Structures are given as C-alpha cells and as structure tokens.
C-alpha cells in the first residue's frame, strides 16, 4: 500500500501554545493512493480457501 503524493506540513497556531498541523502544499503532481496484491498468489489462496469451504 502506497500514497504517492508528497505532502508538506505547515503548523498553524490556534491558541496560546497549541498548534494545528495542517498540510501546506503538495509537491509535484497528485496521484491516487492504492494497494497491490499479486493476482497469482491471491487467486491461489482464494482457491485454497474455497477448497476448505
């Protein structure tokens, strides 16, 4: 699982000695997060499960 954007924090002060850590800027181009599960070794484990089911 990955999140490919490169964020950039920026702390905002909302009171006396307590801050709110915002997100100031995204460096680069914005790209959707995702996760990769190898289709071979996932279909094989689904086969195992369906056999035991």
């Amino acid at each position, epitope marked *: 699982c990955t999140r490919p954007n490169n964020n950039t*924090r*920026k*702390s*905002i002060r909302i009171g006396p000695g307590q*801050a709110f850590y915002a997100t100031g800027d995204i*460096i680069g181009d914005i790209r959707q997060a995702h996760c990769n599960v190898s289709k071979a070794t996932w279909n094989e484990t689904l086969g195992k499960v369906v056999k035991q089911l």
Partner: antibody, heavy 124, light 108 residues
Framework: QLVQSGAEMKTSGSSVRVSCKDSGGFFPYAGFRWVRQAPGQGFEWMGGVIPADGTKHYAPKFQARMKMTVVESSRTLYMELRSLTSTDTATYFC???????????????????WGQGTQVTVPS | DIQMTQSPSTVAAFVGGNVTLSCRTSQGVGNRLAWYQQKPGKPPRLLISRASNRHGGVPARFSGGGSGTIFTLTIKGLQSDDFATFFCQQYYDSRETFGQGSRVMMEK
C-alpha cells in the same frame, strides 16, 4: 532570535559541538536546519530537525560523522561533528524555515531566520 | 540531487545601475526558488520566495523572475547597500541546496 556558541578552534580528529538556542519559542512550531559555509564559497546542507515530531534528517555526506540533538528544557539544538578534518573549517549556521504570520513551515521552505555563525577552524 | 549553477559570478556594477543575475538549476523546481543576500560577516538575508514574491523589508528595486529551470534576479536602481553575495536556493526536493554565490563589486 537564534543565537549560537562562540567561534571555536579544534584539532584534526577531535569532535566539535555547536549549539543553537532560539529565544522566542518557535520550537514546537517550525523546523530548523543546519548549514555550514566553507570560507567564501556558497553553502552546504548539513541537517534538519523538526523538534515537534523529533525527526532528524542528515545529509548523506555528514550522515555518519555528525549527530544532532534537541533539548526542550533549555530550547537548544546541538550539532556534534565527530571526525573533524582540515576541510571541515567553515562558518556553521542554524536556520529556521519560513513563517508567514502564525503558520510556520515544518518540512520544506526557504530559511528566513538565521543564526550569527560559529567559525570553526581546523588546520592540519 | 539538484545542482544550482549561478551564471554571472562577481559582476561589477556602479551605484544607480542595472544588474541582472541568473540561477540555472539542474532539474526543474517549478517555482520553489528563493534568493538570499549575504554581506561578508552577517548571516544571509532572505529576499525573495517563490522566485518572484518579495518580502517585507526588501525594496521594490529587487525583482525575481523566470520559472522552470532558468531564474533571474534584477536589481534595477542600485544603491550602496546592495553590494553583497547573492545566493539562489531551490527548496523543491528533500534537501534544499544553495548556489555558489555571485558577488557584485563597486569598481566604477
């Protein structure tokens, strides 16, 4: 303002500890940088420490030589450079990332507040 | 990494004169580029952010331009307090690196 230790002189092999105390807070709000300037030629990134999350980020060159610490009680950054050399003579600055009002950068901005400098000379 | 080559190094100038620097990066930094100014002893003084946006306390005579890879800095009407060493900094990638300085002299 950030104020540093006085200019020092060390021997080839000894370890030098610079310091950087920031009078005015800004400790849990901004991210500080360690930058050294060789005599009369540009700058050279050397480290960076966000004291809010306590994340240090050493340059690849000075990755094994130095180590930087934070002391929240006295509000001071330390940069201890262990294996000195004749080529580590430089003016050492501690900076602070840009703060636009009350929202301070923590990760990447231009350095807007600098320290006075600590001229460390190591001849050999 | 990212390398900054400052084109005109140690360019002479006279008071009330034009002077144009140049900072050319190795790889594009968008507009994330700052311009510093250091007088021989003091620590640097940040002049410009975002390669065009001046700061509080910088005269209007300073001007940052360009974008992408080639950036400039133009001081239109010089004064006797502007002769220093100007550094350009990218803050795009993880570790911001500076140029090597480009002095401005006073020989008339």
């Amino acid at each position: 303002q950030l104020v540093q230790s006085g200019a020092e002189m060390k021997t080839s092999g000894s370890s030098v500890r610079v310091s950087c105390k920031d009078s005015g807070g800004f400790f849990p709000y901004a991210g500080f940088r360690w930058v050294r300037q060789a005599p009369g030629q540009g700058f050279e990134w050397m480290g960076g420490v966000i004291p809010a999350d306590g994340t240090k980020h050493y340059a690849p060159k000075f990755q094994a030589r130095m180590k930087m610490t934070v002391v929240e009680s006295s509000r001071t950054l330390y940069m201890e450079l262990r294996s000195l050399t004749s080529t580590d003579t430089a003016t050492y600055f501690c900076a602070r990332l840009q703060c636009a009002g009350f929202s301070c950068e923590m990760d990447s901005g231009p350095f807007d507040l600098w320290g006075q400098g600590t001229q460390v000379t190591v001849p050999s | 990494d990212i390398q900054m080559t400052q084109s005109p190094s140690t360019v002479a100038a006279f008071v009330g004169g034009n002077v144009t620097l140049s900072c050319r990066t190795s790889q594009g930094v968008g507009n994330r580029l700052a311009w510093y100014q250091q007088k021989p002893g003091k620590p640097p003084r940040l002049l410009i952010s975002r390669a065009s946006n001046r700061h509080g306390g910088v005269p209007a005579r300073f001007s940052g331009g360009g974008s992408g890879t080639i950036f400039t800095l133009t001081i239109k009407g010089l004064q006797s307090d502007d002769f220093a060493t100007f550094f350009c900094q990218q803050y795009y990638d993880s570790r911001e690196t500076f140029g090597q300085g480009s002095r401005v002299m006073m020989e008339k």
